[PDB]
Design an enzyme around this catalytic site. Structure first.
Site, PDB file in Angstrom:
ATOM      1  N   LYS A   1       0.839  -1.192   0.000  1.00  0.00           N
ATOM      2  CA  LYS A   1       0.000   0.000   0.000  1.00  0.00           C
ATOM      3  C   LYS A   1       0.870   1.237   0.000  1.00  0.00           C
ATOM      4  O   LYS A   1       0.575   2.180  -0.712  1.00  0.00           O
ATOM      5  CB  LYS A   1      -0.940   0.036   1.190  1.00  0.00           C
ATOM      6  CG  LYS A   1      -2.214  -0.782   1.034  1.00  0.00           C
ATOM      7  CD  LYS A   1      -2.832  -1.024   2.403  1.00  0.00           C
ATOM      8  CE  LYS A   1      -4.332  -1.060   2.316  1.00  0.00           C
ATOM      9  NZ  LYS A   1      -4.745  -2.169   1.446  1.00  0.00           N
TER      10      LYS A   1
ATOM     11  N   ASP B   1      -9.643  16.422  27.396  1.00  0.00           N
ATOM     12  CA  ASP B   1     -10.728  16.473  28.339  1.00  0.00           C
ATOM     13  C   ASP B   1     -10.186  16.717  29.749  1.00  0.00           C
ATOM     14  O   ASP B   1      -8.984  16.913  29.930  1.00  0.00           O
ATOM     15  CB  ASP B   1     -11.523  15.164  28.238  1.00  0.00           C
ATOM     16  CG  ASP B   1     -10.733  13.898  28.684  1.00  0.00           C
ATOM     17  OD1 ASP B   1      -9.459  13.815  28.761  1.00  0.00           O
ATOM     18  OD2 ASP B   1     -11.472  12.938  28.967  1.00  0.00           O
TER      19      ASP B   1
HETATM   20  P1  LIG Z   1      -8.922   9.449  27.811  1.00  0.00           P
HETATM   21  O1  LIG Z   1      -8.960  10.745  28.654  1.00  0.00           O
HETATM   22  O2  LIG Z   1      -8.635   9.554  26.314  1.00  0.00           O
HETATM   23  O3  LIG Z   1      -7.700   8.523  28.331  1.00  0.00           O
HETATM   24  C1  LIG Z   1      -7.412   8.475  29.725  1.00  0.00           C
HETATM   25  C2  LIG Z   1      -7.449   7.058  30.295  1.00  0.00           C
HETATM   26  O4  LIG Z   1      -6.588   6.216  29.535  1.00  0.00           O
HETATM   27  C3  LIG Z   1      -7.002   4.851  29.699  1.00  0.00           C
HETATM   28  N1  LIG Z   1      -7.334   4.270  28.407  1.00  0.00           N
HETATM   29  C4  LIG Z   1      -7.478   5.054  27.326  1.00  0.00           C
HETATM   30  C5  LIG Z   1      -7.808   4.489  26.118  1.00  0.00           C
HETATM   31  F1  LIG Z   1      -7.946   5.294  25.041  1.00  0.00           F
HETATM   32  C6  LIG Z   1      -7.993   3.106  26.057  1.00  0.00           C
HETATM   33  N2  LIG Z   1      -8.337   2.517  24.897  1.00  0.00           N
HETATM   34  N3  LIG Z   1      -7.864   2.319  27.152  1.00  0.00           N
HETATM   35  C7  LIG Z   1      -7.537   2.877  28.346  1.00  0.00           C
HETATM   36  O5  LIG Z   1      -7.395   2.178  29.395  1.00  0.00           O
HETATM   37  C8  LIG Z   1      -8.287   4.775  30.549  1.00  0.00           C
HETATM   38  S1  LIG Z   1      -9.083   6.338  30.375  1.00  0.00           S
HETATM   39 MN   LIG Z   2      -8.149  12.428  29.145  1.00  0.00          MN
HETATM   40 NA    NA Z   3     -10.925  10.918  29.727  1.00  0.00          NA
END
Ligand SMILES: *P(=O)(O)OC[C@@H]1O[C@H](n2cc(F)c(N)nc2=O)CS1
Ligand SMILES: [Mn+2]
Ligand code: NA
Ligand code: NA
Ligand code: NA
Ligand code: NA
Length: 296
Positions: free
Chosen positions: A63, A181
């Site tokens: 690709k 966030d």
């Molecule tokens: P969010 O505020 O994007 O991420 C904070 C924490 O990170 C952990 N996390 C994020 C994620 F994108 C995935 N797929 N698994 C995970 O454990 C928990 S919320």
């Molecule tokens: Mn976050």
């Molecule tokens: Na978050």
DNA sequence: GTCGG
DNA sequence: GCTGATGCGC
DNA sequence: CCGACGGCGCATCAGC
């Protein structure tokens, strides 16, 4: 920077695997590949060169070849012009609309945000809130606003009970100049892993009471997810609405929690609660290091 | 899709 | 009405 | 060749 066309292509293909084909392991294969290529310090000149990297294999290499010859992928061109698939992929951008809900809507001829607006009745609560703040949820948050937001949360947690401890984790705690966030960790001496009162609800309620929290996506005994907003002047322009997560962790697992949600991603891989073991006591994040957020 | 048992 | 499976976000 | 590829809280669905 370098290989950006390659990385954009791969991330696009990834999104189609996840949202349209519902093939999550291929979505991760494309993201893994996008990530190693992103960190590769040379401009890639062939598929074979890429192939050397862990996560890049025969199909991604061929690709990369097509892209390098033509600046295009027949396959991606085709699916972007495809009305069904392209619409399914797009609607998933709405928080609360996954791949499954996106396909059912587009099967009923609901393909745009306008179509979603005309059919409120068909959306669940999370999904209405996600539609309402669709553009806001895609904006990043400046540090300056994150500090103002932090000021409101520490002040109000402390007002409900001075024995609460709160910490705004994520990139922000690592000193990053923007954030996606607000993630907040909460504990209270009376909530221990081997013990409990409405310690989350009282905090959420105080923040709704002072109009910091504006809507609720999910809310349980441990985890709240919802929307918040800084106050503005009657003169000055409105702040965007922002995502905020709040987790109630028991006091013992707290600094283990903080460490985990503070990250970074790569740093941690080097559990959340922490040949079966036996639970060690921690009064601080440094007890774990014993057995600095900014330089991470 | 890529890896590795 | 209850439990267990799935969808979703992160 | 052929299986692994992440875990968890909450909302909501499927099934009895
Ligand atoms: P969010 O505020 O994007 O991420 C904070 C924490 O990170 C952990 N996390 C994020 C994620 F994108 C995935 N797929 N698994 C995970 O454990 C928990 S919320
Ligand atoms: Mn976050
Ligand atoms: Na978050
Ligand atoms: Na490789
Ligand atoms: Na979504
Ligand atoms: Na889908």
């Amino acid at each position: 920077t370098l290989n950006g066309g390659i990385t954009d292509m791969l991330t696009e293909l990834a999104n189609f695997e996840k949202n349209v084909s519902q093939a999550i392991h291929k979505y991760n294969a494309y993201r893994k590949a996008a990530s190693v290529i992103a960190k590769y310090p040379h401009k890639i000149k062939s598929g074979a060169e890429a192939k050397k990297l862990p996560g890049v294999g025969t199909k991604i290499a061929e690709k990369i070849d097509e892209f390098l010859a033509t600046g295009k992928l027949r396959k991606l061109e085709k699916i972007r012009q495809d009305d069904t698939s392209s619409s399914i992929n797009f609607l998933t951008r709405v928080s609360g609309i996954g791949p499954s809900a996106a396909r059912k809507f587009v099967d009923e001829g609901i393909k745009t945000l306008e179509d979603l607006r005309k059919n409120e009745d068909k959306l669940n609560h999370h999904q209405r809130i996600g539609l309402k703040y669709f553009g806001d949820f895609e904006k990043r948050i400046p540090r300056e606003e994150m500090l103002q937001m932090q000021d409101i949360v520490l002040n109000e947690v402390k007002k409900v009970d001075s024995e609460y401890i709160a910490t705004v984790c994520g990139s922000f705690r690592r000193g990053a100049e923007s954030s996606g966030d607000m993630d907040v960790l909460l504990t209270h001496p009376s909530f221990t892993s081997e013990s409990q009162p409405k310690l989350l609800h009282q905090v959420v309620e105080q923040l709704q009471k002072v109009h910091f929290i504006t809507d609720t996506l999910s809310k349980g005994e441990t985890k709240f997810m919802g929307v918040c907003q800084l106050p503005s002047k009657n003169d000055e322009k409105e702040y965007p609405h922002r995502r905020i997560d709040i987790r109630l962790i028991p006091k013992d697992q707290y600094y283990c929690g903080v460490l985990y949600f503070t990250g970074s991603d790569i740093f941690n891989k080097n559990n959340e609660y922490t040949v079966a073991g036996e639970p060690l006591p921690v009064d601080s994040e440094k007890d774990i290091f014993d057995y600095e957020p900014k330089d991470r």
